[PDB]
């Protein structure tokens, strides 16, 4: 009945009174089947 | 009946009184089937 | 009956009293079938 894929990429700074966060070549596959 | 793919990319700064966050070549595939 | 793809790209600054956030070549494929 119900088939769900959820993919989230979170990127956040909280700078209060530089900053580097890199994602370098991500590859994502999601395989969900039924028989 | 119901087949859902959800993909979200979140990018956020909170600067209160530079900033770098890079995503570098993402590749996303979502494969959900039924038989 | 129901077949849904949802893709969202979020890009946001909150600057209160520079900023760089880059996405560099994203490739997205969404494959959902039925038999």
Author numbering:
A (entry chain B), B (entry chain A), C (entry chain C): 274 to 290, 304 to 321
What does the paper say about this structure?
The physiological function of tau is to promote the assembly, and possibly stability, of microtubules. Here, we used cryo-EM to determine the structures of heparin-induced filaments assembled from recombinant full-length 4R tau (2N4R, 441 amino acid isoform) and the corresponding 3R isoform (2N3R, 410 amino acid isoform) to resolutions sufficient for de novo atomic modelling.
The extent of the ordered core, comprising residues 274–321, is almost identical to that of twister filament. There are three β-strands, β1 (274–290), β2 (305–310) and β3 (313–321). Again, the structure is characterised by an overall kink, which, with an angle of 52° between β2 and β3, is the least pronounced of the three 4R tau filament structures. Instead, one long, slightly bent β-strand extends from residues 274–290. The K280 side-chain points towards the inside of the core and makes a salt bridge with D314, whereas the K281 side-chain points outwards, and forms a salt bridge with D283. The strand residues on the N-terminal side of K280 have also their orientations reversed, and form a new cross-β interface with the β3 strand of R3.
